[PDB]
Amino acid sequence: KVFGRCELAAAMKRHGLDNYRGYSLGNWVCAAKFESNFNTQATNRNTDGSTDYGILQINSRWWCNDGRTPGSRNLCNIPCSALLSSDITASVNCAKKIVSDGNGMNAWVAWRNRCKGTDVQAWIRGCRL
């Protein structure tokens, strides 16, 4: 499922992401935009053999099990395929664990390079939240 900007904002808000660990809703929507272009089915292979899954491009080396990343930890206790679902619950729950890890949203490269320090409030403009 490819989410609309405001549709995703509302879904993330309902799932408790607005201001989670101090990150306003705009940050999460911006991250999703640049990580997967709002597509829940996005997957990307990394040079180290691990794969990024879903709306927030969560990595298989540490967070989910995809059966093909040797020596990986499954910290979110879920199969990576669960992260490609149209229901973002699994992605959100796992994202919460990642952002609490210590590096905050810096864990998401696209966020660090394209959202951090920008007017993230623009990502939720016009939305009925």
- Nominal resolution (angstroms): 1.8
What phi and psi, each to the nearest 5 degrees, are found at residue 104? 60, -145
Domain-wise residue ranges, the chain = 1-129
- In the DSSP assignment, the letter for residue 115 is T
Closest-CA residue to 123 (of 41, 35, 15): 35
Say whether domain 1-129 belongs to CATH 1.10.530.10.
Answer: yes
Which 3 state secondary structure label does DSSP give 33? helix
Contact 28, 16 (CB under 8 A): no
Query: After which residues do gaps appear in the chain, with C to N over 2.5 Å?
Result: none
Edge-to-edge strands, sheet with 58-59: 43-45, 51-53, 58-59
Burial state string for 22-51 with b = 16 or more CB within 10 A and e = fewer than 16:
ebbbbbbbbbbbbbbebebebbeeeeeebb
Is 87 annotated as belonging to a binding site? no
35 as an active site residue: the answer is yes
The H-or-E segment that residue 96 falls in is helix 89-99
- Single out the catalytic residue among 7, 18, 35, 66: 35
Measured between alpha carbons, how far is 51 from 68 in angstroms, rounded to an integer?
A: 9
- Single out the catalytic residue among 52, 66, 87, 119: 52
